[PDB]
Amino acid sequence: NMDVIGERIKRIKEEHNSTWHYDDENPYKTWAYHGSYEVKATGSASSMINGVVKLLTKPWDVVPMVTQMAMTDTTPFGQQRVFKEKVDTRTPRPLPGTRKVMEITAEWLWRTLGRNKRPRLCTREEFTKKVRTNAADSAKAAVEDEEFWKLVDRERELHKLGKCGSCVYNMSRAIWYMWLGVRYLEFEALGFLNEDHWFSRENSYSGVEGEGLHKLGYILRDISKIPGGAMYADDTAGWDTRITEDDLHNEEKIIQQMDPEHRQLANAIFKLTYQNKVVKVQRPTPTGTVMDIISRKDQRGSGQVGTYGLNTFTNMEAQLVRQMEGEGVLTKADLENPHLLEKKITQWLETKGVERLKRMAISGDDCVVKPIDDRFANALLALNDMGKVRKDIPQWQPSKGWHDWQQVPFCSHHFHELIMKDGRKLVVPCRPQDELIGRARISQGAGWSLRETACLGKAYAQMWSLMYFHRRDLRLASNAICSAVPVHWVPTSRTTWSIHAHHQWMTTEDMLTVWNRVWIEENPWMEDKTPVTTWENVPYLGKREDQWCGSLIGLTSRATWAQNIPTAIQQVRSLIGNEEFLDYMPSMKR
Ligand SMILES: O=C(O)Cc1cc(CC(=O)O)cc(-c2cccs2)c1
Ligand SMILES: O=C(O)Cc1cc(CC(=O)O)cc(-c2cccs2)c1
Ligand SMILES: [Zn+2]
Ligand SMILES: [Zn+2]
């Protein structure tokens, strides 16, 4: 293991030799520990509160889920216990027949994914353009510095020699340059999966990359039309910690489709930073805070570029294998058998494969599968053997499915079919409201002006206008926030890091115009392109469903809040100053 990780540890060791030691009382049981060095503590036990949002969402001040979200630990104290709970585990090795099935499925899945697209290297100017269009943190400063690009080249020359000196995953400007450069190199070799949308629904069949939250519901409604059993959506208990050495080696087969110069750099990312890794993790001690140097040959680093794609790939593979078991193609005897017949797996993949991929919606560890029947509910031998053990359910207890696509959980959401006042149907995203309000009430970090705060608030308000307008409490709170925040202030900072977010709310353009573009114009499932002229024609969930999904509708405190909301708007306005404000409350029934 050391002839791959040695150089990186050697560099950390030399750089921090002042405080470098072997802390014999380290908590690593499954990870190989190398040593520690003293550092300053990072993060907090709490989260900064967005006063603009809080002042306009008073009934949620006394709501447990909302209070819970204001917390979330990021200190070495919080970092160490979260690591213990899942990261410090070992997945047993899948059986020889399981390993063969995964291999046959991996090979076929990669050829299917690359039937039209061809892998390619990603560039310095692609990364640069991305870093620029993200902020508009000190990554823009590094990208602008030619000295950063020089280290990148030095590291790349080591990678071409099959060596690694600075690619360390984290749980002066020199170390920041080494991190952003490690991320650039991985972006260079594996970014094409994201940048050239390999997991789009059109290229992957099961995939949903680049579709967006507003489309996921319509995708599930279309899967519901496919004849078969119920729709299954099983969560995996810590997916990234369940990525085996066999998963990594199967994921690596993509290098076969690459040009020699691309294959060489991609092989370097896989072999040196995925199938081997050097990790940095903050740990508190009775004599301060230390940064530990750990390593392992398996599991997925959640921060990395290829994480979404390679998780989508392995889940598609895992679900195809579970479908084969459901159909009686794979038996218990087959999974135990090294010499299992490749023929029947190839026969099933070449005749039923694509059709079987079309029965699924897969986004990283999130899957929705509509098998040909319900034998799938009890097809658990391979899923458990592959290491993809379902969360909070006895290992051999049959999976429970849904016969209504609207009850199906996918990507922290459920989806509703709404009938508009004109009779047209919408399929909308939904989640418990407390999670939405609770998240909007969190401002990111310290040293933030009221201006930056009001703009983040405006961003959350407009995201709600576009994605969650059907939630009565959120349309009101959204209008209230947009009334309290000056009209020309541009929503700045992201509301989410979600791959399903396309941030159409990050504008000063009229939200009803934007709504019409997303839900009517650009909506492939909206045949009638007649615009909606008024927010009064933009539908809500039925009162019942709105209440079932967390609404305070019908409560006194909520009616009080709704009644006295111009007072709170005025309070926020007076504190902001003599700016230009537009009153968005008239756009509502009140
Ligand atoms: O159901 C609709 O179509 C009308 C509608 C809209 C709204 C939204 C707003 O607050 O202006 C709220 C309510 C309710 C507040 C208390 C009980 S029901 C009803
Ligand atoms: O990616 C996920 O797992 C699901 C998810 C989660 C969240 C919450 C968060 O990231 O803070 C927000 C969203 C979005 C809100 C609008 C468009 S996408 C989606
Ligand atoms: Zn490296
Ligand atoms: Zn709902």
User: How many of the other CB atoms lie within 10 Å of CB of 137?
Assistant: 7
The helix/strand/coil state of 293 is strand
Lookup: tokens for 254: 């993509």
User: How many of the other CB atoms lie within 10 Å of CB of 367?
Assistant: 23
CA dihedral 12, 14, 15, 17 (to 10 degrees): 100
Residue 62 CB-density burial (10 A; 0-12 exposed, 13-18 middle, 19+ buried): exposed
How far is residue 101's CA from residue 340's CA, in Å, rounded to a whole number?
9
- CB-CB contact of 400 with 110 (8 Å): no
- CB-CB contact of 91 with 298 (8 Å): yes
Lookup: tokens for 142: 């590094």
How far is residue 560's CA from residue 8's CA, in Å, rounded to a whole number?
61
- CB-CB contact of 67 with 463 (8 Å): no
Q: Give 107 Cα–ligand 3 centroid separation in angstroms.
A: 27
- CB-CB contact of 62 with 572 (8 Å): no
Residues in the chain: 590
* Residue whose C-alpha is closest to residue 127's, from 89, 178, 184: 184
Pocket lining: 472 vs ligand 1, CB cutoff 6 Å: yes
Q: How far is CA 132 from CA 28, 137, 345, 445, 536, in A?
A: 39, 10, 47, 21, 38
For atom 6 of ligand 1, the residue with the nearest CA is 472
Q: Give 507 Cα–ligand 3 centroid separation in angstroms.
A: 39
Q: Which atom of ligand 2 is nearest to the CA of 498?
A: 1
Q: Considering every ligand atom shown, identify the ligand nearest to the alpha carbon of residue 560 and give its number.
A: 1
Antiparallel, parallel or unpaired: β 414-419 and 32-38: unpaired
Q: Give 432 Cα–ligand 4 centroid separation in angstroms.
A: 7
User: How many of the other CB atoms lie within 10 Å of CB of 427?
Assistant: 23
For atom 7 of ligand 1, the residue with the nearest CA is 472
Lookup: tokens for 322: 């579970």
The helix/strand/coil state of 435 is helix
**Residue carrying structure tokens 């100053």:** 577
Q: Which atom of ligand 1 is nearest to the CA of 539?
A: 3
- CB-CB contact of 457 with 486 (8 Å): no
Q: Does the annotation flag 122 for ligand binding?
A: no
Q: Does the annotation flag 549 for ligand binding?
A: yes
How far is residue 517's CA from residue 501's CA, in Å, rounded to a whole number?
16
Antiparallel, parallel or unpaired: β 277-285 and 169-170: parallel
Pocket lining: 418 vs ligand 1, CB cutoff 6 Å: no
368, 411, 498, best to mutate for ligand 2 pocket (most atoms within 8 Å of CB): 498
Exposure string over 148-160, b if 16+ CB within 10 A, otherwise e: bbebbeebbebbe
How far is residue 541's CA from residue 448's CA, in Å, rounded to a whole number?
36
How far is residue 389's CA from residue 238's CA, in Å, rounded to a whole number?
9
Question: How is residue 390 annotated by DSSP?
Answer: B
Q: Considering every ligand atom shown, identify the ligand nearest to the alpha carbon of residue 270 and give its number.
A: 3
Residue 588 CB-density burial (10 A; 0-12 exposed, 13-18 middle, 19+ buried): middle
Rg (CA), the chain: 26
Quick one: angle between helices 433-440 and 472-484, nearest 10?
20
Give the residues surrounding ligand 2 with Cβ less than 6 Å away.
Answer: 213, 411-412, 439, 463, 467, 496-501
Pocket lining: 588 vs ligand 1, CB cutoff 6 Å: yes
The helix/strand/coil state of 277 is strand
Q: How far is CA 476 from CA 203, 468, 470, 540, in A?
A: 40, 11, 11, 12
Q: CA 179, 182, 188: angle at the middle one, nearest 5?
A: 140
Lookup: tokens for 86: 């899942």
Contacts of 15 (CB under 8 A, 6+ apart): none
Q: What are phi and psi of 34, to 5 degrees?
A: -115, -40
Residue 577's region, left for phi above 0, alpha for psi from -120 to 50, else beta, is left
* Residue whose C-alpha is closest to residue 198's, from 130, 118, 258, 257: 118
Helices (H), 56-198: 64-69, 76-82, 96-113, 124-135, 139-144, 146-160, 173-190, 192-195
User: How many of the other CB atoms lie within 10 Å of CB of 423?
Assistant: 7
* Residue whose C-alpha is closest to residue 246's, from 385, 408, 400: 385
Helix (H) or strand (E) holding 169: strand 169-170
418, 476, 553, best to mutate for ligand 1 pocket (most atoms within 8 Å of CB): 553
How far is residue 391's CA from residue 561's CA, in Å, rounded to a whole number?
39
For atom 14 of ligand 1, the residue with the nearest CA is 553
Lookup: tokens for 174: 């020199």
- CB-CB contact of 216 with 361 (8 Å): yes
Contacts of 428 (CB under 8 A, 6+ apart): 214, 217, 415, 416, 418, 467, 468, 470, 541
Contacts of 487 (CB under 8 A, 6+ apart): 508, 580, 581, 582
Lookup: tokens for 58: 């008073």
Residue 396 CB-density burial (10 A; 0-12 exposed, 13-18 middle, 19+ buried): exposed
Report residue 398 CA to chain centroid gap.
27
**Residue carrying structure tokens 């959204």:** 478
* Residue whose C-alpha is closest to residue 27's, from 292, 244, 300, 301: 292
Report residue 45 CA to chain centroid gap.
23
Contacts of 397 (CB under 8 A, 6+ apart): none
Residue 470's region, left for phi above 0, alpha for psi from -120 to 50, else beta, is alpha
How far is residue 38's CA from residue 19's CA, in Å, rounded to a whole number?
6
Contacts of 6 (CB under 8 A, 6+ apart): none
Q: Give 404 Cα–ligand 1 centroid separation in angstroms.
A: 27
Q: Considering every ligand atom shown, identify the ligand nearest to the alpha carbon of residue 414 and give its number.
A: 4
Query: Looking at this protein, which amino acid is placed at residue 394?
Result: P
Helices (H), 270-367: 307-326, 332-336, 343-357
Pocket lining: 471 vs ligand 1, CB cutoff 6 Å: no
Q: How does DSSP assign 9-31, residue by residue?
A: HHHHHHHTTTT-B--TT---SSS
Q: Does the annotation flag 414 for ligand binding?
A: yes
214, 308, 368, 412, best to mutate for ligand 2 pocket (most atoms within 8 Å of CB): 412
How far is residue 538's CA from residue 9's CA, in Å, rounded to a whole number?
58
Q: Which atom of ligand 2 is nearest to the CA of 439?
A: 11
The helix/strand/coil state of 487 is coil
- CB-CB contact of 485 with 576 (8 Å): yes
Query: Looking at this protein, which amino acid is placed at residue 218?
Result: Y
* Residue whose C-alpha is closest to residue 283's, from 32, 79, 489: 79
Q: Considering every ligand atom shown, identify the ligand nearest to the alpha carbon of residue 435 and give its number.
A: 2
Pocket lining: 562 vs ligand 1, CB cutoff 6 Å: yes
How far is the first Cα of the chain from the last one, in angstroms, to the nearest whole number?
A: 68
- CB-CB contact of 56 with 565 (8 Å): yes
How far is residue 196's CA from residue 312's CA, in Å, rounded to a whole number?
15
Q: What is the stated resolution of the deposited model, in angstroms?
A: 2.4
The helix/strand/coil state of 583 is coil
Q: CA 135, 140, 144: angle at the middle one, nearest 5?
A: 150
Lookup: tokens for 32: 């190989």
Pocket lining: 545 vs ligand 1, CB cutoff 6 Å: no
Q: 281 - beta bridge partners?
A: 292
For atom 9 of ligand 2, the residue with the nearest CA is 496
How far is residue 499's CA from residue 194's CA, in Å, rounded to a whole number?
10
In the chain, the largest separation of any two C-alpha atoms, in whole Å, equals: 78
Q: Which atom of ligand 1 is nearest to the CA of 546?
A: 1
Quick one: angle between helices 433-440 and 450-467, nearest 10?
160
Contacts of 109 (CB under 8 A, 6+ apart): 313, 316, 317, 320
* Residue whose C-alpha is closest to residue 388's, from 102, 169, 111: 102
- CB-CB contact of 426 with 214 (8 Å): no
Lookup: tokens for 216: 């996921």
Q: Which atom of ligand 2 is nearest to the CA of 435?
A: 8
Walk me through the domains of the chain, giving residue ranges and CATH numbers.
Answer: 1-42+76-89+165-171+275-297 (3.30.70.2840), 43-75+412-590 (no CATH), 90-121+191-274+298-411 (no CATH), 122-164+172-190 (no CATH)
Q: Give 272 Cα–ligand 3 centroid separation in angstroms.
A: 7
Lookup: tokens for 74: 């990021």
Q: Does the annotation flag 430 for ligand binding?
A: yes
- CB-CB contact of 441 with 50 (8 Å): yes
Give the technique used to solve this structure: X-ray
Q: Count CA within 13 A, CB hemisphere, residue 500.
A: 18
Q: Give 524 Cα–ligand 2 centroid separation in angstroms.
A: 22
Q: CA 237, 240, 244: angle at the middle one, nearest 5?
A: 100
How far is residue 574's CA from residue 551's CA, in Å, rounded to a whole number?
29
- CB-CB contact of 207 with 368 (8 Å): no
413, 443, 496, best to mutate for ligand 2 pocket (most atoms within 8 Å of CB): 496
How far is residue 442's CA from residue 150's CA, in Å, rounded to a whole number?
38
Q: Is the dihedral of CA 343, 345, 346, 350 positive or negative?
A: positive
Q: 169 - beta bridge partners?
A: 279
How far is residue 411's CA from residue 498's CA, in Å, rounded to a whole number?
10
Lookup: tokens for 328: 């009686």
Contacts of 509 (CB under 8 A, 6+ apart): none
The helix/strand/coil state of 107 is helix
- CB-CB contact of 437 with 55 (8 Å): no
Pocket lining: 480 vs ligand 1, CB cutoff 6 Å: no
How far is residue 292's CA from residue 283's CA, in Å, rounded to a whole number?
7
Query: Looking at this protein, which amino acid is placed at residue 100?
Result: K
